[PDB]
Each structure stands twice: as C-alpha cells, then as structure tokens.
Amino acid sequence: GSSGSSGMCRKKPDTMILTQIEAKEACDWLRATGFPQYAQLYEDFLFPIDISLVKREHDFLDRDAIEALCRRLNTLNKCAVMKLESGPSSG
C-alpha cells in the first residue's frame, strides 16, 4: 500500500467554485445512492477513477443501474482533472 503522497495543487481564478457544485452533486449521490466508497475517493483527490473498471467489476448490474452510476463517476472524472485543461464540451 501507500502512506499518502497525493501531492499539491494550485489555485487560479477560473471555474474554481463552479466545479465544486458539479462535483459535490456527483459525490453527494455516490454516497447518497449506495456507494459510500465512490464518494470518498474523490474526497481524497484520487479521481479521475477507472470508469471502465467500475463497469467490468460491476457487470452484474443492469444497463440502467450502470449508466446511472457512471453518469456520476464521469462527471467527476473531469471535475477532478479539469485543472489540466478546461474542457470545451460543445462550446
């Protein structure tokens, strides 16, 4: 395992708060849905996470259940890396 060397980050005036909302929503759900582990990962600045994995491992779930679960993970996969690049989503 590891002790904890996540690292450090910078703070720049740009979509700093906005992201907080988009993320908070996803996280709150991850824990307010049944997966208290998916809401803790992001909290530890672990994201983005292996989306394709959450599916392969949870292949048992149904298409709807999976899609819904992913709809949250993805939203974070970008809200946790957006730092690198804004991310022009059709704009």
Side-chain angles (χ1 to χ4, degrees), residues 42 46 55 65-66 83:
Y42 179 111
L46 282 177
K55 301 161 152 160
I66 288 310
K83 198 273 170 297

Side-chain angles (χ1 to χ4, degrees), residues 20-61:
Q20 205 202 96
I21 298 89
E22 296 313 276
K24 182 273 199 182
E25 289 169 323
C27 299
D28 179 45
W29 177 94
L30 295 168
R31 172 205 182 82
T33 194
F35 303 107
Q37 47 165 350
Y38 282 135
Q40 191 76 267
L41 290 165
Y42 179 111
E43 279 284 291
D44 202 64
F45 320 117
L46 282 177
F47 269 70
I49 65 163
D50 280 316
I51 302 297
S52 59
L53 183 294
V54 173
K55 301 161 152 160
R56 89 184 296 187
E57 274 279 273
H58 306 233
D59 154 69
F60 69 91
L61 284 174

